Amino acid sequence: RFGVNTENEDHLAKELEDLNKWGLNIFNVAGYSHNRPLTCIMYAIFQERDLLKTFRISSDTFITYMMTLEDHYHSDVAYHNSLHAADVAQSTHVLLSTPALDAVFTDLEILAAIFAAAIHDVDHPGVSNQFLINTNSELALMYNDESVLENHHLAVGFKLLQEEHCDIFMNLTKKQRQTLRKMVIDMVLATDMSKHMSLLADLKTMVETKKVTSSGVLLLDNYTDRIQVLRNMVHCADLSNPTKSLELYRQWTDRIMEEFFQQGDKERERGMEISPMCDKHTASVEKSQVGFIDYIVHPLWETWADLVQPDAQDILDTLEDNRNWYQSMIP
Ligand SMILES: O=C(Nc1c(Cl)cncc1Cl)c1ccc(OC(F)F)c(OCC2CC2)c1
Ligand SMILES: [Mg+2]
Ligand SMILES: [Zn+2]
């Protein structure tokens, strides 16, 4: 089905043993599956959690949909291609298994979070919301300058479900489809970085009033509480590159800066003001990664670590180490 060469056969399976671990190498997975990491990992994650059985999704329909989804990720965009969506989906799969959230979420909520991660950047053009708005692009006109890309990703992901041969949610009840849709919209719209501060603040509240039962698991009474953790989960996963091993983090940084600089060039050709971190002639990649961790990634992930204490300590230590590595690359 994947046509994985007889030579990449066991290499792939050897990589997929780390499926449930933070240390999984999605680059290795993309290379052994003929650059189909999103399809590959999503199939693996769905078999592990036995989601195909629970929601009666035929294996053919699942593959057909994921393949088409993966094809809507642009392979010429340096960072926001299917490897990132696969990375965010697999990272979310690991966060959902963290001991402090054990048995807290329904199967339907697990399905929604992983599906959301998978579609969260589909058909990304390699430019930011602010670029699309400043250039009066069709998408900004379409979405009235609000969470332009995030709304688009959702629109494409759900639209690919319209044909029967691609409808993975055909066996959910009407009710389940409507709840899953609400959760997915919510989670994907929350990946808009302009909502980041609002999200971090609400998560700090959740940590302050966190009630963990005798089982050592968090108590989340209402839907409001659960979707609040899920939004933050996908958001942390989206901002997890600097929490990975240094070998992986540096390749992600290479990819993001290649995309950001490409937008700098486009802004320069059009006579627009260049965002300072986006300017290949002046910006220090190393200073920007240090600023990224101190002011965005560390504040979020330390808060997340508090809520799931102590499951995330390794993540925090890797983050401080990677930060110090980039700081040591600045003269
Ligand atoms: O913003 C990001 N991601 C992103 C998210 Cl989480 C949500 N919405 C849009 C984007 Cl671009 C993002 C992701 C990864 C980065 O570096 C490394 F980890 F690869 C990075 O560098 C900051 C810095 C150079 C100026 C920025
Ligand atoms: Mg995005
Ligand atoms: Zn993303």
Swiss-Prot record:
Domain PDEase as annotated: residue spans: 4-331
Binding site for AMP: H80, H84, D121, D238, Q289, F292
Expression by tissue: Expressed in brain, heart, lung and skeletal muscle. Expressed in white blood cells.
Sequence positions that bind Zn(2+) 1: H84, H120, D121, D238
Family note: Belongs to the cyclic nucleotide phosphodiesterase family. PDE4 subfamily.
Function text: Hydrolyzes the second messenger cAMP, which is a key regulator of many important physiological processes. May be involved in mediating central nervous system effects of therapeutic agents ranging from antidepressants to antiasthmatic and anti-inflammatory agents.
Protein name, entry field: 3',5'-cyclic-AMP phosphodiesterase 4B
Organism name: Homo sapiens
Full protein segment contained here: 327 to 657 of 736
